[PDB]
Write a protein that binds this ligand. Sequence first.
Ligand SMILES: NC(=O)C1=CN([C@@H]2O[C@H](COP(=O)(O)OP(=O)(O)OC[C@H]3O[C@@H](n4cnc5c(N)ncnc54)[C@H](OP(=O)(O)O)[C@@H]3O)[C@@H](O)[C@H]2O)C=CC1
Ligand SMILES: CCc1nc(N)nc(N)c1C#CCc1cc(OC)ccc1OC
Length: 190
Amino acid sequence: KPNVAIIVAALKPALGIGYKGKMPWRLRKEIRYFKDVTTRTTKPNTRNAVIMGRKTWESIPQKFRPLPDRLNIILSRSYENEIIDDNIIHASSIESSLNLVSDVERVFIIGGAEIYNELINNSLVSHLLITEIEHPSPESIEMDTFLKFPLESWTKQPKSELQKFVGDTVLEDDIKEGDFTYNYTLWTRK
Ligand SMILES: NC(=O)C1=CN([C@@H]2O[C@H](COP(=O)(O)OP(=O)(O)OC[C@H]3O[C@@H](n4cnc5c(N)ncnc54)[C@H](OP(=O)(O)O)[C@@H]3O)[C@@H](O)[C@H]2O)C=CC1
Ligand SMILES: CCc1nc(N)nc(N)c1C#CCc1cc(OC)ccc1OC
């Protein structure tokens, strides 16, 4: 089996993630956390996979595309299940994409909304890496895109389990970037 996790940054308490196809924030440490965790492998001869919707792919800046050091899987309902090049796979589903290569250690679902809100209730996903973002006045930030997670069916793990998961990665508490404050968290199924 492949270890499949969801990684996302969301604003509490509504868990908003975007506005008009855009990200409502630019968090410099968070971006860097995202990179290190999705890239890091333990075993040699392995890579990690990043799975995403077509729209999230289209929104990734030209030069960061495909996301380096990781296998990129792009999801569309139009896609045949084929390898485009060494770094890029097109797929109809996660299940179809997993049966396409075997060099993968960890699989990370990286967005967007339609992808998250569907794969949250898929049994393959065993971990959630949610960056919980806070703001003194959350409603002042314009938001039309939200997570629909039944978090009552999941367990927020201790920091020690997250540290285990992300290896040596530095996990700072209450990161203050402008008016935003955030923490990295780990969730497992009940
Ligand atoms: N804060 C965060 O950590 C993140 C936030 N975001 C935000 O999310 C938003 C984007 O989300 P969203 O608009 O939903 O776009 P998505 O990235 O989720 O892409 C949607 C597309 O994915 C394809 N798709 C959806 N479900 C499936 C499925 N079950 N099987 C195969 N393909 C599927 C469809 O492609 P098709 O139509 O071609 O068939 C659909 O049009 C943006 O606002 C972005 O800023 C994104 C990533 C991270
Ligand atoms: C913002 C980076 C990020 N952090 C967390 N915790 N989860 C995520 N899924 C993401 C993401 C994403 C997609 C994306 C990545 C990117 O390179 C960093 C640039 C743009 C992106 O979508 C607009």
